[PDB]
């Protein structure tokens, strides 16, 4: 099976690509694989695939780390979310966000439903396990518990059974048959569990697969409209029906492939400590325990030799800046288009810590529109950040079409010098914050609300008749044939490869 | 003579740290020299030396081009500097800024004065030269003219005698004897000048220095205090007095190993069309000429084979932001410390094209302030933002302990995560405003005023109780001994030099 539809089949592409590192001696889950996977994640090493774990038993499990991190050449930087997306190693970031972009106008192809799959080649019962006993990973040291759940999918289906949600949302073992978890506003997890909550009857049925099929799990990384059944979305993205198993305990439907399933239930009506966790903005704060959801596992499935991926997130860079923040870039640039804004691009640099989206202006467009700086920026802001695609999402740089948003010291340039600050900018406060930044849950206001910035980085000409500079770089600054004159004759003066 | 008390033994430390490129076969100073110049700063490559410019003719000139910019390498990135300052090529930032703020509570050296130099061994008197036949650079393709003037240092007294100003100011070949030139507050050169028109007699006797001591350069882009006679600082700070010999036809005193040397006048009434030029900011507006400082040359002296030194500024990373942004930086760090803010260390980074400027707090002495941020934000913008050492600056992060302002990755990630949008900002409306930044001189408000922010990125713990976070990364969310073992096994278990 292909690598974007098969976790196991996306291990051995990491192999193929010379981009896994195997690691056979003994590696403790408390610390040490997470350690291990910290340091790839912040130096842009080979993904680390922990073959032997201290504490696996019967088959659960090892570990992969580092799934959508980043490589170290510029040439693959993104290959190991190409690989999620059957897409070449060499693709853009563009690239990467059409690929994830182009269901939106596409019928969903709703996923196949298959007798048996390799997720149940083994089982246990409620009397056989203990999640305490497994070899969950501590991730960071001030962690408030065993974070199980950092790469797998959250499967939940409204009451009226018309929408099944997929979603990573983080889970901690809470004891043998319990996790707690964030299902936080305005997350379609939290949602569906309040359709559950009104309905008053009974607990959500639920089901968490890890190691799912790697296209899945991008979608599940991002924002995709209310009420659209992730599945049929990836359906439509990869042009094929994914397969899917009935849970043993339940009605809901897992991946053929998923390396291990959690079958149970998400409570209504119980809570538990949840946190602290080394959390996307780069900061744990210990001792910050609060009252999460609650899950009951009732069984588990798994593949032989399970694989549980992980994602040690933190400080630059990993999944966590890597999908959230770019996933969440192209659900904006669809939404500003679908509101007649005219944005061609749109990217959340890493420099920010994925708090900013960077929005590239057509500026033809734009001048057509016989507009002003502040009712632009209202409007962008506006359709924003009261959207979920724009939840996480505290500042916004608009900038004009010379400037490639892809690339973080170009965006900063801009914003740097063309926004002056306040009177280019537009505050927001009545609209919902992502708590999860310090500066929101552990700063000064309010940790729900407001906090967010649109920095308009387009000049004045830009909205009436067009540039009118030039920069001050080798690119604009000479002629053609000069630049070209130098670039032939720079190795033979005395100064100093594409792949590398 | 050393390299930082003269600048042909500067040149030779540059080929002797294999930091130099000579080249040898014909150059046009039209466009050419200034590419190949742009290049090499936007790719840290070696110091471009011309040494056979069309045009040259008697002596005047060959060209040396990034003599400020950076080197490849992380270990000595700021080796230029350095050898402006006689410290060794692998000095920190922190040594660099350091040096340069430490005359600043020491007595003067006065100057020597010696009855020749290098600089008097050649002279054409106001008949035998024309600027316009020397092979003055177009640096860029939509300059105003050709900016003869990037790397000198200009020399001006008061009218009383009192205090001699050395400075670096732009300036360009108006005519056969003539420059113009930037002169705006508020600039030393600019309240010399102002002091000599309101006296109404006389234009200003000036002169021109280029290819002057490395380590007066230096000082000539930092804003030491109002009053203060650069010489006599770098006396100070190199430990010896400077050498330097009287002008010809003024009483001004030059460095006696200055390159070449113009004499002449700065009228208090004239002026003439100046630019546009490409900027520190990296922008050059095509068309936007305005009247400048008109300066009269009525002599030039010149040593053998006279090297003119250049900057081909723009964007990232040349002179105007590894000198401009950091010795300004320096004078705000000490600015700071004697106004009892509890400040250690600042830089501008280079991702703000240097408008921003990190201050590092000692959160201890802060929280003995028993202050707010409002407040706190407050102090320290009156203290910079009404000050000349904070005039190219418009905006200042203040950070914790924890963060180091010499590393723009940790100040982005501070900004972006500690300070909330608005609600954690003061802007500074009533200041004076740098107009060269594209939002400001081409913005959406006054050219001259406002635009400036104070943007804290302390966490509320930091002014009362202390800071409650560990950061989710490598360093600070595993143990000692854990990371170490890691460290020690990364090559071991597959994984991937100081100087490179
Ligand atoms: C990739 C990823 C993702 C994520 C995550 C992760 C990862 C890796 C971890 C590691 C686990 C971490 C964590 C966190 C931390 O940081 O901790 C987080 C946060 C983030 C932001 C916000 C808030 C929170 C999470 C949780 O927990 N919760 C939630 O809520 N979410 C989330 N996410 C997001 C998501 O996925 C989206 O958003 C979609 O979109 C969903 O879906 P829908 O369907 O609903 O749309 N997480
Ligand atoms: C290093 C350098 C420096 C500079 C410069 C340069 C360089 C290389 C060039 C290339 C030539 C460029 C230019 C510009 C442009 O960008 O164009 C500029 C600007 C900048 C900012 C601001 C405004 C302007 C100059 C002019 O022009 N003007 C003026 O004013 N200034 C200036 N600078 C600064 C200075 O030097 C300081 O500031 C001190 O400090 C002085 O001294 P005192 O004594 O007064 O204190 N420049
Ligand atoms: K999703
Ligand atoms: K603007
Ligand atoms: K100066
Ligand atoms: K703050
Ligand atoms: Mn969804
Ligand atoms: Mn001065």
């Known amino acids: 099976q292909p690598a974007h539809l098969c976790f196991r089949s996306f291990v051995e592409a990491l192999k193929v690509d010379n981009d896994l590192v195997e690691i056979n001696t003994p590696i403790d889950p408390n610390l040490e694989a997470a350690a291990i996977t910290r340091r790839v994640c912040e130096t842009n090493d080979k993904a680390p695939l922990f073959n032997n774990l201290i504490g696996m038993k019967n088959g659960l499990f090892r570990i992969l780390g580092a799934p959508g991190s980043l490589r170290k050449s510029s040439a693959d930087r993104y290959g190991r979310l190409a690989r999620h997306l059957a897409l070449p190693p060499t693709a853009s970031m563009r690239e990467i966000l059409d690929k994830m972009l182009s269901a939106s106008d596409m019928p969903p192809i709703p996923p196949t439903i298959v007798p048996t799959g390799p997720c149940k080649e083994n089982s246990l019962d409620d009397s056989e396990f203990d999640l ?151 900061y744990i704060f210990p001792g910050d325990t609060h009252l999460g959801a609650k899950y009951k596992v009732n069984r588990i499935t798994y593949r032989n030799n399970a694989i549980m991926p992980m994602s040690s997130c933190g400080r630059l860079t990993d999944e966590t800046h890597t999908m959230i923040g770019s996933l969440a870039a192209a659900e904006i640039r669809k939404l500003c288009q679908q509101n007649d804004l005219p944005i061609t691009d749109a990217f959340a640099p890493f420099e920010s810590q994925v708090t900013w989206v960077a929005l590239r202006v057509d500026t033809e467009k734009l001048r057509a529109m016989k507009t002003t700086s502040e009712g632009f920026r209202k409007r ?39 926004c002056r600050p306040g009177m280019d900018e537009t505050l927001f406060e009545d609209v919902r914050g992502l708590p999860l930044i310090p500066y929101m849950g552990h700063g000064n206001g309010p940790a729900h609300r407001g906090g967010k910035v649109v920095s308009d980085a387009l000049m004045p000409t830009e909205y009436t008749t067009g540039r009118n500079w030039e920069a001050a770089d080798f690119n604009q600054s000479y002629p053609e044939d000069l630049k070209q004159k130098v670039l032939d004759n720079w190795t033979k003066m005395g100064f100093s490869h594409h792949h590398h």
């Open 132 to 282: 305490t006993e497994l070899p969950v990973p501590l991730i960071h040291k001030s962690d408030g518990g065993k974070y199980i759940q950092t790469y797998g999918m959250h499967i939940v289906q409204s009451p009226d059974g018309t929408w099944t949600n997929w979603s990573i949302a983080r889970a901690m073992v809470h004891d043998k048959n319990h996790l707690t978890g964030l299902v936080i506003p305005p997350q379609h997890i939290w949602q569906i569990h309040q359709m559950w909550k009104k309905e008053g009857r009974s607990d959500v049925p639920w089901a968490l697969a890890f190691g799912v099929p790697p296209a899945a799990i991008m979608a599940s990384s991002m924002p995709i409209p209310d009420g659209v059944t992730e599945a049929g979305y990836v359906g439509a993205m990869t042009g094929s029906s994914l397969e899917l198993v009935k849970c043993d305990t339940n009605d809901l439907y897992v991946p053929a492939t998923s390396e291990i399933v959690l079958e149970g239930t998400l409570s209504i009506s119980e809570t538990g400590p949840e946190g602290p966790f080394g959390e996307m903005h780069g």
């Open 380 to 418: 962008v802001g506006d359709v924003v950040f009261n959207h979920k695609a724009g939840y996480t999402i505290h500042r916004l740089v608009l900038v004009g079409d010379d400037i490639d948003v892809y690339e973080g010291k170009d965006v900063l340039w801009a914003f740097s010098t063309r």
